[PDB]
Design a protein around this ligand. Structure first.
Ligand code: SF4
Ligand code: SF4
Length: 77
C-alpha cells in the first residue's frame, strides 16, 4: 500500500481526494491520511499529489515508517 509522510503536511491540502478508487483518503485536519490497509496498491494519488511524496509503505524511510504506523493505526482503532 501507498502512504503519505512529511512533505505533505500543509493545512487543508485538496488533491489526493476524489481520485482514490476505494475512497481511503481521510483528513487528520491538516493533511490527508491514506489507509494503507484499504488502499489497493495503486499509484493515482501520488501522481495527483503536486509534490510527489506518497510512497509505498515499504519504501518510506525508517524515520518516516512512523507515519506508516500512524496511517495504519488511524483507522485500526
Ligand atoms: S496531495 Fe499530497 S500534500 Fe496533499 S494531502 Fe495529499 S499527499 Fe498530502
Ligand atoms: S494509491 Fe490508489 S488506492 Fe491507494 S490510496 Fe492512493 S489512490 Fe487510493
Amino acid at each position: 500500500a501507498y502512504v503519505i509522510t512529511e512533505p505533505c503536511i500543509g493545512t487543508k491540502c485538496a488533491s489526493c481526494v476524489e481520485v482514490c478508487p476505494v475512497d481511503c483518503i481521510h483528513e487528520g485536519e491538516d493533511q490527508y491520511y491514506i489507509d494503507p490497509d484499504v488502499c489497493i496498491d495503486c499509484g493515482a494519488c501520488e501522481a495527483v499529489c503536486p509534490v510527489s511524496a506518497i510512497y509505498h509503505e515499504d519504501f518510506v524511510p525508517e524515520e518516516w515508517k512512523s507515519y506508516i504506523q500512524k496511517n495504519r493505526d488511524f483507522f485500526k482503532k
